[PDB]
Write an enzyme that holds these catalytic residues in place. Structure first.
Site, PDB file in Angstrom:
ATOM      1  N   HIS A 110      29.153  90.003  11.911  1.00  0.00           N
ATOM      2  CA  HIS A 110      28.058  90.845  11.302  1.00  0.00           C
ATOM      3  C   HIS A 110      26.628  90.671  11.893  1.00  0.00           C
ATOM      4  CE1 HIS A 110      30.427  92.915   8.287  1.00  0.00           C
ATOM      5  NE2 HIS A 110      31.040  91.771   7.984  1.00  0.00           N
ATOM      6  N   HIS A 161      27.121  94.137  16.486  1.00  0.00           N
ATOM      7  CA  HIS A 161      27.836  94.992  15.493  1.00  0.00           C
ATOM      8  C   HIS A 161      26.989  96.234  15.141  1.00  0.00           C
ATOM      9  CE1 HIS A 161      29.805  96.471  11.813  1.00  0.00           C
ATOM     10  NE2 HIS A 161      28.737  96.133  11.089  1.00  0.00           N
ATOM     11  N   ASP A 173      23.157  95.955   8.119  1.00  0.00           N
ATOM     12  CA  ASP A 173      23.677  94.598   7.888  1.00  0.00           C
ATOM     13  C   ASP A 173      22.603  93.520   7.985  1.00  0.00           C
ATOM     14  OD1 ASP A 173      26.355  94.966   7.016  1.00  0.00           O
ATOM     15  OD2 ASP A 173      27.145  95.315   9.072  1.00  0.00           O
TER      16      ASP A 173
HETATM   17 ZN   LIG Z   1      28.591  96.622   9.252  1.00  0.00          ZN
END
Ligand SMILES: [Zn+2]
Length: 307
Positions: free
Chosen positions: A69, A73, A110
């Site tokens: 994450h 990503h 994120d």
């Molecule tokens: Zn994600």
């Protein structure tokens, strides 16, 4: 420098076959700008370029770096967002401001990933989907708030020139889209998505707009599954590396635990990933390629799965 044209990054940058994870990390901020340029956002919204550079540098800098994450990503989700723009021709489906919000959401969604796995909503369908899932819809996250804290940093306000009304609409879109990444959110709107694909997308329905934006958001988050075999293999590794990121073994146990990967990844494909890209294909004939490719990865996983 000034912005590179997409075609100069790679002749294949705009193709579903392209793997954005293979871009060196140092070239990713520039590639964000290239994509916003090729999508015509810089020009159409008259975005100051130094400002957009600072903004992008600022969100990249704000990512932690767990195995999975992490910025790469985020970068690769954003890049898939761009691929959906180019290949599905989203401007015939959504408004410019929605597409723009979707993209910035990919970049930002994120920022506050914690990895605190505290919910059984996703796990009930797929134990590994629960590790891939972003957080925010069951436990409160601040991906969104952090995005704005960046926005309101001197020299970073890329929506500075928007009207007040478009500025709220932009922020509302980001808040809602970022929330929608969480797979618990997806499961909760799944029947609505199914209904939308059955009845057919309706450009005049504002509900259809909201639903499509969630579907597209989740389609970008899991887009690692639409790449080559090597990519799902490498991503499965990373998710593991993350979840074990700190407890006395009774080397040994680690290997028993990776022997489970094939079945978990298959359950993840069958119960979560494939339905999502089935929906995209139902709405967008040109997305067939994507479902086929996820299907083919489910096959390799099945094939491998007799370690
Ligand atoms: Zn994600």
């Amino acid at each position: 420098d000034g912005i590179q044209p997409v075609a100069a990054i790679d002749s294949n940058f705009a193709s579903f076959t392209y793997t954005p994870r293979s871009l060196p990390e140092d070239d990713t901020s520039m590639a964000i700008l290239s994509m916003l340029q090729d999508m015509n956002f810089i020009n159409n919204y008259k975005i100051d370029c130094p400002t957009l550079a600072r903004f992008c540098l600022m969100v990249k800098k704000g990512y932690r770096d767990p195995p999975y994450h992490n910025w790469m990503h985020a970068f690769s989700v954003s890049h898939f967002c761009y691929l959906l723009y180019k290949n599905l021709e989203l401007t015939n489906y959504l408004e410019d401001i929605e597409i723009f919000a979707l993209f910035i959401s990919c970049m930002c969604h994120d920022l506050d990933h914690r990895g605190t796995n505290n919910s059984f909503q996703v796990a009930s369908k797929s134990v590994l989907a629960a590790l891939y899932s972003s957080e925010g819809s069951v436990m409160e996250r601040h991906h969104f708030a952090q995005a704005i804290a960046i926005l309101n940093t001197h020299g970073c306000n890329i929506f500075d020139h928007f009207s007040r009304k478009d500025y709220q609409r932009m922020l509302d879109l980001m808040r809602d889209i970022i929330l929608a990444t969480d797979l618990a959110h997806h499961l909760r709107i799944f029947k609505d998505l199914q209904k939308m694909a059955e009845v057919g997308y309706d450009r005049n329905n504002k509900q259809h707009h909201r639903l499509l934006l969630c579907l597209l958001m989740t389609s970008c988050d899991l887009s690692d599954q639409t790449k080559g075999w090597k990519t799902t293999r490498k991503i499965a590794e990373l998710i593991y590396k993350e979840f074990f990121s700190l407890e006395k073994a009774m080397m040994e146990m680690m290997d028993r635990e990776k022997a489970y990967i094939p079945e978990l990844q298959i359950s993840f494909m069958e119960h979560i990933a494939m339905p999502i890209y089935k929906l995209l294909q139902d709405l967008f004939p040109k997305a067939a390629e994507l479902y086929e490719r996820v299907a083919s990865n489910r096959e390799h996983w099945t094939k491998v799965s007799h370690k």
